[PDB]
Design a protein around this ligand. Structure first.
Ligand SMILES: NC[C@H]1O[C@H](O[C@H]2[C@H](O)[C@@H](O[C@H]3O[C@H](CO)[C@@H](O)[C@H](N)[C@H]3O)[C@H](N)C[C@@H]2N)[C@H](O)[C@@H](O)[C@@H]1O
Ligand SMILES: O=C(O)c1ccccc1O
Length: 150
C-alpha cells in the first residue's frame, strides 16, 4: 500500500515521461515500506531535510499541497518521532520543523537505497551520461513552463 496509498509526437513525448511515474513508485516502494514509512510522509520528510529549519507554511507552498494533508502528514511524521517542532507558543502552522536523529537515520538510509536502485536501472540500459545530461535539459525546460505558469 506504500505506492498504492499515494494513489502526435508531443503526445508521445509527454507520455514517455508522465507514464513512468507510477511504475517507478511501485518499484521504489519496498525501499520505503522497509522503514515503515509512506510516500507522502517520505516526500515531506525529505522536504524538511533539504530545507530545515522549515515550517508547515513553507512546506505546503514548496511541496505544493493543501495545509490539511500537509498537516495530517506532518503529525504522523511527528507522531513517529522523525521530525521535531521548536516549542514556542505560536500557531502550529508557523512553528519550525527539523528531523530528529531517528529521521536523519531513516532519511539517509532511504536516500542511499534509491540512489542504488536508480544507478542500477541505468546500468541495465544503453543510455549514456550524455543522454542523461541531455534528457535533463529537455525536461527542465518543461518543468519551468509548468511552474512559471502555476
Ligand atoms: N509534490 C509531488 C512530488 O512528486 C515527486 O515524488 C518524488 C519523491 O521524491 C520520491 O521519493 C523517493 O523515491 C524516489 C525514487 O528514487 C527518489 O527519487 C526520491 N529522492 C526519494 O525521496 C518518490 N518515490 C517519487 C518522486 N521522486 C517529486 O519527487 C516531488 O519533487 C514532487 O513535488
Ligand atoms: O501537532 C503538531 O505538533 C503540529 C505541528 C506543526 C504543524 C501541524 C501540527 O499538527
Amino acid at each position: 500500500t506504500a505506492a498504492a496509498k499515494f494513489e502526435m509526437l508531443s503526445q508521445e513525448f509527454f507520455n514517455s515521461f508522465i507514464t513512468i511515474y507510477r511504475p517507478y513508485l511501485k518499484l521504489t516502494e519496498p525501499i520505503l515500506e522497509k522503514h515503515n514509512i509512506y510516500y507522502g510522509q517520505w516526500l515531506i520528510l525529505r522536504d524538511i531535510a533539504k530545507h530545515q529549519p522549515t515550517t508547515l507554511i513553507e512546506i505546503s507552498h514548496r511541496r505544493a499541497i493543501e495545509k490539511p494533508t500537509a498537516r495530517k502528514t506532518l503529525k504522523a511524521l511527528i507522531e513517529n518521532d522523525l521530525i521535531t517542532v521548536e516549542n514556542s507558543l505560536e500557531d502550529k502552522r508557523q512553528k519550525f520543523l527539523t528531523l530528529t536523529p531517528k529521521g536523519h537515520e531513516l532519511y539517509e538510509i532511504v536516500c542511499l537505497d534509491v540512489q542504488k536502485l536508480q544507478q542500477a536501472v541505468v546500468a541495465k540500459t544503453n543510455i549514456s551520461q550524455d543522454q542523461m545530461q541531455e534528457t535533463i535539459n529537455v525536461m527542465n525546460q518543461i518543468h519551468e513552463i509548468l511552474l512559471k505558469e502555476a
